[PDB]
Amino acid sequence: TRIIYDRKFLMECRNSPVTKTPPRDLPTIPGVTSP
């Protein structure tokens, strides 16, 4: 069955400590990304 998330929960997850590190292979695109 489908994995569904409402807005409030998605917003609460932003505070998680794992969201403070950029994705591992984020490319360098000056002005666009912050690796």
Partner 1 sequence: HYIKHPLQNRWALWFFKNDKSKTWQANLRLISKFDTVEDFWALYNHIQLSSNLMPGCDYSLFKDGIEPMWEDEKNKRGGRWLITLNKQQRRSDLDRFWLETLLCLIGESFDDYSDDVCGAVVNVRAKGDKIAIWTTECENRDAVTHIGRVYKERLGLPPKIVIGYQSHADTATK
Q: Does 28 bind partner 1 (CB under 8 A)?
A: no
Helix (H) or strand (E) holding 7: helix 7-13
Compute the distance between CA of residue 23 and CA of residue 10 in angstroms, rounded to an integer. Answer: 18
Place of tokens 């590190």: 21
**All residues at 6 or more sequence positions from 19 whose CB lies less than 8 Å from its CB, including other chains:** 13
Please state the closest distance from residue 17 (CB atom) to partner 1, in A.
Answer: 7
Q: Does 23 bind partner 1 (CB under 8 A)?
A: yes
Please state the closest distance from residue 25 (CB atom) to partner 1, in A.
Answer: 7
Binding site for partner 1 (CB under 8 A): 2-7, 10-11, 13-14, 16-23, 25-27, 29, 31-35
